[PDB]
Each structure stands twice: as structure tokens, then as C-alpha cells.
Amino acid sequence: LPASIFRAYDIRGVVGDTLTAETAYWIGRAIGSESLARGEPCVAVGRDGRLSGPELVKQLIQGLVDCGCQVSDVGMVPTPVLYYAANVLEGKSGVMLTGSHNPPDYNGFKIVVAGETLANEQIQALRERIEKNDLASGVGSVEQVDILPRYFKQIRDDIAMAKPMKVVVDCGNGVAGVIAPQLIEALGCSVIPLYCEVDGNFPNHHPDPGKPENLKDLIAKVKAENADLGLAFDGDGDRVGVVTNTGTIIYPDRLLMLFAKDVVSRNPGADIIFDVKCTRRLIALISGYGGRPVMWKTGHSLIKKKMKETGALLAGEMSGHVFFKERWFGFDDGIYSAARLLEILSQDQRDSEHVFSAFPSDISTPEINITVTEDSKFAIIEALQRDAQWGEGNITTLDGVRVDYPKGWGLVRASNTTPVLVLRFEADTEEELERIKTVFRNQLKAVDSSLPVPF
Ligand SMILES: [Zn+2]
Numbered sequence: 001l002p003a004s005i006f007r008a009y010d011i012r013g014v015v016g017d018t019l020t021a022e023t024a025y026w027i028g029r030a031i032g033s034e035s036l037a038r039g040e041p042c043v044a045v046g047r048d049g050r051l052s053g054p055e056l057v058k059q060l061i062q063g064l065v066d067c068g069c070q071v072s073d074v075g076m077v078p079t080p081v082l083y084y085a086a087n088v089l090e091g092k093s094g095v096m097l098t099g100s101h102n103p104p105d106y107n108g109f110k111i112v113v114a115g116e117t118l119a120n121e122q123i124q125a126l127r128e129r130i131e132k133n134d135l136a137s138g139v140g141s142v143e144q145v146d147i148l149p150r151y152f153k154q155i156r157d158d159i160a161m162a163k164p165m166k167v168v169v170d171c172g173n174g175v176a177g178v179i180a181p182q183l184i185e186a187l188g189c190s191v192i193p194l195y196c197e198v199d200g201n202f203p204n205h206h207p208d209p210g211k212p213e214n215l216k217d218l219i220a221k222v223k224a225e226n227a228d229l230g231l232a233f234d235g236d237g238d239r240v241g242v243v244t245n246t247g248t249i250i251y252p253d254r255l256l257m258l259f260a261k262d263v264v265s266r267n268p269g270a271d272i273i274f275d276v277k278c279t280r281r282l283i284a285l286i287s288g289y290g291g292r293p294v295m296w297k298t299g300h301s302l303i304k305k306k307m308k309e310t311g312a313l314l315a316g317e318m319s320g321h322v323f324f325k326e327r328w329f330g331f332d333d334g335i336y337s338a339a340r341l342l343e344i345l346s347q348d349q350r351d352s353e354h355v356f357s358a359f360p361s362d363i364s365t366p367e368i369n370i371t372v373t374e375d376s377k378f379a380i381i382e383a384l385q386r387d388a389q390w391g392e393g394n395i396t397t398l399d400g401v402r403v404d405y406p407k408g409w410g411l412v413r414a415s416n417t418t419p420v421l422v423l424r425f426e427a428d429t430e431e432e433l434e435r436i437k438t439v440f441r442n443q444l445k446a447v448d449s450s451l452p453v454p455f
């Protein structure tokens with residue numbers, strides 16, 4: 001049975017509750033059926049370092065084999081490593097059992113089928129195969145594969161560190177510690193490990209570098225050891241956080257600026273994708289270097305579809321997923337992105353603080369949240385889209401309502417997993433900021449005079 005675990009970009013839930021082995025079995029069955037339906041019997045399977053996993057894989061794999069698929073099992077590995085398998089093995093399908101950065105009892109499935117990362121209706125399709133028992137049946141197969149070494153090798157062969165660097169690597173007790181300290185070490189660095197022991201209990205901070213609180217120990221170690229950079233991976237390793245030698249947290253939009261400058265120098269006119277939460281500075285910077293800027297929707301999986309659709313050589317989103325296609329395969333991977341970042345910084349005699357500090361900075365507000373209600377969440381964005389008036393602002397309604405003015409912008413959208421409206425604003429001078437926070441405040445009040453707007 002049921003459902004709130006068939007989300008938009010994956011399947012997630014509590015390991016001994018909404019998601020039990022049983023549920024995992026009928027999901028592997030769905031996945032196996034669809035892959036077959038796309039002409040793909042070969043599927044890979046990889047898992048993260050969760051407690052609930054060791055078994056689960058099992059119910060998942062039993063589900064694939066009871067379809068007739070040839071399962072290539074890669075055991076415990078980083079998410080991008082699973083994605084790597086689905087790109088290099090024979091089958092272009094792959095399934096990673098994972099709960100990302102969620103708490104220890106959460107787990108789930110990120111699914112790739114015949115090359116495509118399933119989303120939205122593609123995932124529901126899966127569920128609705130169980131609700132009618134429309135799955136396939138067959139005499140599957142299971143083979144053990146060890147891909148990590150070839151993954152490890154591929155990057156090492158690709159990267160060229162120029163000077164040496166001392167780096168603090170924090171894994172959060174998630175699955176990155178199986179190759180991240182090592183590879184970065186192998187890459188040509190000295191590594192101060194922080195929580196790089198796979199432990200699904202998460203004795204320390206959870207592996208979510210998206211929240212600053214989880215970079216406090218990281219930020220202190222960098223300073224205390226006079227390291228050149230600090231890195232933090234999420235639980236399953238498709239996300240990376242960055243801090244400079246002085247402890248400044250680099251946000252992904254700023255990270256992309258460094259990456260776009262690099263990618264575009266070797267690929268004139270390259271398409272570069274970022275989301276509606278990324279600084280407009282990114283737009284001008286990409287253009288200035290000769291590239292084609294492409295603002296798209298938020299959602300690792302959506303960014304990914306857009307990339308194949310546009311031929312983009314690089315993508316990123318504010319949640320930290322960085323997607324390299326130049327020299328790579330086009331999927332998100334915090335490990336490879338780290339590598340790529342070390343590559344660039346190693347070739348600059350300045351320290352990491354100045355490299356990033358040199359980029360233009362506007363006046364930005366932090367992310368603002370407004371608890372509304374589940375019932376009203378989407379309808380508020382719709383009312384704005386229908387009736388808000390924004391002057392000569394350029395309106396992007398790809399994902400909520402983003403309005404770009406010449407000297408600043410603002411965003412309002414609905415969270416897909418909380419009854420909350422999420423906002424952001426940025427502008428060069430403070431007088432233009434408040435004039436933008438004012439146009440939004442007013443349009444919101446025009447929707448509902450009783451809505452609480454804290455700005
Ligand atoms: Zn992740």
C-alpha cells in the first residue's frame with residue numbers, strides 16, 4: 001500500500017513505518033517493470049550508510065529480480081557513484097537506496113531508468129502499478145559489482161591539482177567517507193577528516209551542509225589548523241558545502257560563478273543552468289564570459305532534465321547540487337565538484353577567501369519563510385500570478401513568482417514539503433532593496449490583507 005512516499009523527485013519515508021521492507025519490495029517491482037518497458041533489463045543498485053539499508057537493498061533487489069532484471073549490485077556507495085554505474089555499466093538503469101540528509105530512520109529511492117531520472121508523473125506511474133498489480137514477473141539475476149575503484153580512478157585521472165592544499169573534509173558520518181577524504185588525499189592534498197566514519201546513527205551533526213549550524217565544527221577546524229579550504233558533504237554525497245580558509249561559507253550560486261568562468265573558457269557559447277534562487281549576477285557573469293545563461297526550476301531532477309534538453313555543460317542549484325557535463329556525465333556529484341573546485345583553486349596563488357571575495361556582491365536578504373497553510377500555499381502564488389502588478393519588472397513564473405528589475409530582484413514561491421512561502425531578495429544598493437521588498441509586501445497584502453509579511 002501507500003503513498004505519501006511517492007514524492008516529486010524520489011520516494012522517501014520512515015524505515016519502520018511508512019516505508020517497510022514490504023513497501024520496498026513492491027517498489028523494486030515497479031522499477032523493474034518500467035525499466036523493462038523501456039527496453040532495459042540491466043539495473044544497478046547502490047546504497048548509502050543508513051542503518052535501515054543493509055536489509056532494504058534486499059527487499060528492493062528481490063523486487064528487481066522478481067521482474068526478470070539483471071541487477072548489478074554495487075553495495076554501499078555515494079549516490080553519484082550509483083549514477084556513475086548507470087552511465088558506465090551495460091545497463092543505463094540504476095537505483096540508489098537512500099535517505100539523503102534526513103534523520104537516521106529515513107530512507108528512500110532515487111531512480112534512474114533507461115538514462116532518465118524519473119520525476120512527478122513518472123514516479124506516480126510506479127505507485128499506480130502496485131495499486132493495480134500491473135508489474136512484471138520473471139527469473140531475475142543478481143551480480144556483485146565493485147565500481148568505487150573505477151569511479152575513484154576516473155576523477156583522479158581527470159583532475160590536475162597544481163599546488164598543494166590542506167583541506168578539512170567533513171562527511172557528517174554519511175556515506176561520503178568511503179572515498180572523499182581518500183580521493184581528495186589522492187588528488188594531492190592533506191586531509192583533516194571530520195566525521196568521516198560511516199555511521200547511520202549520526203552521532204554528530206546530521207549530514208546537511210545546507211544548514212549553517214552544521215558547518216560550525218567544520219568552520220572552526222579550518223581556522224584552527226590553518227587549512228586552505230573546508231568541505232562538507234551531505235549524507236549520500238550528491239551535495240557539497242564549501243568554506244574558505246578564513247571560514248566564509250560559499251553559497252552555490254557563488255560557487256557556480258567560479259565554475260562557469262572555468263567551463264566557458266573552453267567552450268564558447270556553452271549553456272549554463274542555475275535556478276530562480278540564484279543571484280542575477282550569475283546571469284551577467286555567464287554572458288560576459290561568452291556563455292548562454294539559462295534560469296530554470298528548482299529540483300535536482302528537473303535541472304537534470306533541462307541539461308540534456310539544452311546541451312548545457314554545467315548546472316547548479318541553491319541547495320548545493322552541482323552538475324558538470326564538461327568532462328563528466330552530467331549528473332550531480334559533490335565529490336567530483338569538490339575535485340573540480342580544488343582543481344581551480346590549486347592554480348591560483350591567492351587564497352580561497354580572495355578568489356571568491358573578488359566576485360561582485362549585492363545586498364541580499366537571507367532566505368525568508370512564511371508559514372501559511374497547506375490549503376492556501378499554492379493558491380497564494382496563483383493569485384499573485386493572476387493579479388499582482390510589478391511595474392516593468394520581468395516576471396518569471398517558472399517556479400513561483402520571480403521578478404527581475406534592473407537593479408535587484410525578489411522571489412516568492414511555495415515549498416513542496418511544508419505549508420510555507422519562501423522568499424528571497426537581492427539588489428545592489430539598499431534603497432533599491434527596500435523598494436523591491438516593498439513591491440512584494442504590497443502584492444502579498446493585495447492577495448490577503450491579513451497575511452503576515454515580516455519585511
Ligand atoms: Zn543528497
